[PDB]
Amino acid sequence: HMNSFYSQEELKKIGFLSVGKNVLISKKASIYNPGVISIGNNVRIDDFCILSGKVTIGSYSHIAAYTALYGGEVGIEMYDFANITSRTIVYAAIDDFSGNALMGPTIPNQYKNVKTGKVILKKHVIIGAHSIIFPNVVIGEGVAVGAMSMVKESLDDWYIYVGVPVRKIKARKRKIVELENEFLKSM
Amino acid sequence: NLYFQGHMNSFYSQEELKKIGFLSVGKNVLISKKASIYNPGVISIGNNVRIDDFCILSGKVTIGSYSHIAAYTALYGGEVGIEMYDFANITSRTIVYAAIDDFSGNALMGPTIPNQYKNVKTGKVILKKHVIIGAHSIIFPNVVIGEGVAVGAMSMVKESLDDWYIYVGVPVRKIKARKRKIVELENEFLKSM
Amino acid sequence: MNSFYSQEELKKIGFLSVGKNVLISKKASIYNPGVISIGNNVRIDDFCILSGKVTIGSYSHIAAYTALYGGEVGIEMYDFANITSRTIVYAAIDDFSGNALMGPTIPNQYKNVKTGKVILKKHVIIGAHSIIFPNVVIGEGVAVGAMSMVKESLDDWYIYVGVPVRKIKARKRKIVELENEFLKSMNS
């Protein structure tokens, strides 16, 4: 009733590819194939998140509650100061919706048409709540995507995007870069 | 170590499945221990089914065979029921309701209020063969989703949908026909068993 | 059958206050119950998160997956308010503009958190998969539809839909007549 996080002790026992310092992971999150999951320093991952398969997170990042990172074999990577708000999904693989293929994990590979590609969230990216990020996209440096937004293509740096599928609505301010430097100085 | 630490998968053993009390459960059935199943005596499931973490199945729910019910998905079947036919699949974080309250302001609402004061709209939800429901979608009561229909991510379905079309939006609109190459694939895949 | 805590388990949780016929999932998360007040006849379902200052009245259903982050300012729901599944209510959020660093991994002085009490008045219903931002008063009798986003207070007795929401029709007031009927039948 205070917090649900693993102790540093139990964290070491999960078997992550790598795990940094001050990492707070919820016991109510699911972690599958931790040997291909790498986490930097100062990371928080909240209840009912799912990390599955190849996932790489840097430093100063919050993965809020209910968020699913399906990294598959090609991987999802987040850079430093990226953050994901609650209930987001990031897929590195998805089934073909068109009608040209059978679908999903109960069906063999030879009948499906899985679309796959590494997803990267560059530095300072923020993903708004209830959003969905499709495979093989780079979310540009300093990009913000609004709540309930859907991204199927890579996003140009330093813009704010909204909607389903997203469209660009205004520049993201770049004062956070100064703040990053100021913050890192003080440390 | 990994398997027993809970970091390979979360599914019940087949021994455990039997102890849950499903009306009917098939072979090769993988259900997360982190899903919630309420009133398993009215729930039945065919063969080759996977139901992921944090799903909820409550009340009358019938799933056939070769179906994935992805993580966070809730199926509230109540007394009227939700049925999915074979090769139907539902992506993450979908909700299907066989009953909802009246939003108009003409009735009181939800499970803390007695029924005489409510005006619950109920009706069976059927997803026919090869239906795919994209992530973060909502299906409302008394809806038939026709054979081969695809609903896009973040879509809301309040009416029955025509077979073999793709629909998107809130509420959904028809955008293009679904291809039917899958009808061949099904035949070819079953023909090698 | 059901996942609710017993009366005995509820009292071990430590709520600032908790009423009778309160049905709370064991698979929900409650953080800082010390600042959480709940009235009578309340149901909170699987995979809910209530964290920080949250006050709920009576005759309210918080459906599954719903997160209420009250932080320090608080979230408050008045009687007969209800929240359908997978809603988020935030009493604080980060500045998205690019003028401020973001989130719990960063000290306050580099961030620009907007904070303010969120209030849902009597007979409010929030449709599934919706988001309510800080410092919003949802007026008495408001319905917001599924997949709504609400960034600003909403006028009483209207139905709103969309992202961000727009007012589409009046909500009917018969529900107040039913409220008084129901309450009357329960006192005599």
Ligand SMILES: CC(C)(COP(=O)(O)OP(=O)(O)OC[C@H]1O[C@@H](n2cnc3c(N)ncnc32)[C@H](O)[C@@H]1OP(=O)(O)O)[C@@H](O)C(=O)NCCC(=O)NCCS
């Ligand atoms: C994206 C966002 C930052 C934009 O807010 P803003 O800069 O104040 O912009 P506005 O509210 O003026 O909207 C500008 C345009 O975008 C639309 N819009 C804003 N947010 C949108 C969204 N999430 N989806 C679709 N459209 C949206 C507005 O309707 C407006 O459209 P118009 O020009 O056609 O009128 C904000 O709406 C948002 O989505 N924040 C998400 C917060 C969150 O998820 N937080 C959780 C973690 S701390």
Ligand SMILES: CC(C)(COP(=O)(O)OP(=O)(O)OC[C@H]1O[C@@H](n2cnc3c(N)ncnc32)[C@H](O)[C@@H]1OP(=O)(O)O)[C@@H](O)C(=O)NCCC(=O)NCCS
């Ligand atoms: C529905 C879907 C298949 C359509 O993709 P597509 O056939 O490539 O079509 P496009 O991307 O060209 O979109 C066609 C139109 O529909 C709109 N659209 C596409 N997807 C939409 C959605 N999910 N919601 C609302 N509108 C959508 C597009 O904006 C475009 O509109 P326009 O005609 O006004 O320009 C795809 O966008 C989608 O939603 N896939 C869901 C995948 C998923 O949820 N997967 C889970 C894991 S396996």
Ligand SMILES: CC(C)(COP(=O)(O)OP(=O)(O)OC[C@H]1O[C@@H](n2cnc3c(N)ncnc32)[C@H](O)[C@@H]1OP(=O)(O)O)[C@@H](O)C(=O)NCCC(=O)NCCS
């Ligand atoms: C909001 C709601 C009550 C409106 O239903 P309705 O009064 O029957 O109205 P309609 O279906 O005619 O829609 C009116 C307009 O709103 C739009 N609309 C309806 N619901 C919408 C929604 N959730 N988001 C965005 N637009 C919506 C319609 O497209 C229509 O637009 P138009 O006039 O431009 O054609 C209903 O659509 C809804 O969202 N219900 C949510 C139920 C739920 O969440 N339940 C779970 C717990 S019991």
Ligand SMILES: Cc1cn([C@H]2C[C@H](O)[C@@H](COP(=O)(O)OP(=O)(O)O)O2)c(=O)[nH]c1=O
């Ligand atoms: C959301 C969440 C919170 N908590 C605990 C740890 C947090 O320090 C505390 C408050 O979190 P939260 O309510 O998100 O507030 P803040 O944004 O101010 O950190 O509750 C968890 O343990 N797991 C969770 O999933």
Ligand SMILES: Cc1cn([C@H]2C[C@H](O)[C@@H](COP(=O)(O)OP(=O)(O)O)O2)c(=O)[nH]c1=O
């Ligand atoms: C999503 C999820 C995965 N898993 C485990 C078992 C899966 O075989 C493994 C990977 O699943 P997933 O990451 O969905 O990959 P794929 O689409 O390739 O099957 O993770 C669970 O146990 N429960 C879950 O809810």
Ligand SMILES: Cc1cn([C@H]2C[C@H](O)[C@@H](COP(=O)(O)OP(=O)(O)O)O2)c(=O)[nH]c1=O
């Ligand atoms: C959704 C849910 C149901 N249940 C149990 C108790 C409920 O009475 C039962 C059926 O609930 P539900 O399917 O929500 O139906 P209704 O609206 O008719 O109450 O399942 C839980 O214990 N926790 C849950 O989160």
Ligand SMILES: [Cl-]
């Ligand atoms: Cl969710």
